[PDB]
Amino acid sequence: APMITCRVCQSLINVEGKMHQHVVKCGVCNEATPIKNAPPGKKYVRCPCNSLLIAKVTSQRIACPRPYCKRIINLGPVHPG
Ligand SMILES: [Zn+2]
Ligand SMILES: [Zn+2]
C-alpha cells in the first residue's frame, strides 16, 4: 500500500485509491493531512488544536472554528503601532 504519515499523530495512512484527494483522514487521530497543495491563492494552516484550516495567502490572522478551540492564529509577524 502507498502510505503517507499523518502530520498530527504520525500513524500511517493507507492512501490506496485516495491519491486524487486534496487531504486524507487519519483513522487514529481523526485529523486531516494534506496530500496536495492548497488550491491557488490558499494555504493550509495547522491549528494547535490539530485542525487543518484553509487561509488565504493574504490573510494575516485566521480563527479556528472548532467550538472547543476558537483560537486565533497569527500567520505572520506585525509591526508596532
Ligand atoms: Zn493521525
Ligand atoms: Zn483549533
UniProtKB/Swiss-Prot annotation:
Q: Which UniProt keywords apply?
A: Cell membrane, Cytoplasmic vesicle, Endosome, Hydrolase, Lipid metabolism, Lysosome, Membrane, Phosphoprotein, Transmembrane, Transmembrane helix
The annotated active site, in chain numbering, is 55
Q: What is its main location?
A: membrane
Protein name (database record)? Type 1 phosphatidylinositol 4,5-bisphosphate 4-phosphatase
Report the source organism.
Answer: Homo sapiens
Write out the annotated subcellular location. Answer: Late endosome membrane; Lysosome membrane; Cytoplasmic vesicle, Phagosome membrane; Cell membrane
Its taxonomic placement starts with:
Eukaryota, Metazoa, Chordata, Craniata, Vertebrata
> What conditions trigger expression of this protein?
By sterol depletion.
Describe the subunit structure: Interacts (via transmembrane domain) with ATP6V0D1. Interacts with LAMTOR1. Interacts with RRAGA and RRAGC.
Gene Ontology terms for molecular function: phosphatidylinositol-4,5-bisphosphate 4-phosphatase activity
**Gene for this protein?**
PIP4P1
Q: In which tissues is it expressed?
A: Ubiquitous.
Briefly state the protein's biological role.
Catalyzes the hydrolysis of phosphatidylinositol-4,5-bisphosphate (PtdIns-4,5-P2) to phosphatidylinositol-4-phosphate (PtdIns-4-P). Does not hydrolyze phosphatidylinositol 3,4,5-trisphosphate, phosphatidylinositol 3,4-bisphosphate, inositol 3,5-bisphosphate, inositol 3,4-bisphosphate, phosphatidylinositol 5-monophosphate, phosphatidylinositol 4-monophosphate and phosphatidylinositol 3-monophosphate. Regulates lysosomal positioning by recruiting JIP4 to lysosomal membranes, thus inducing retrograde transport of lysosomes along microtubules.
According to its UniProt entry, one GO biological process term is: positive regulation of TORC1 signaling
Q: Which residues of the full protein are shown?
A: 79 to 159 of 277
Cellular component per GO, a single term? late endosome membrane
Domain of life per record = Eukaryota
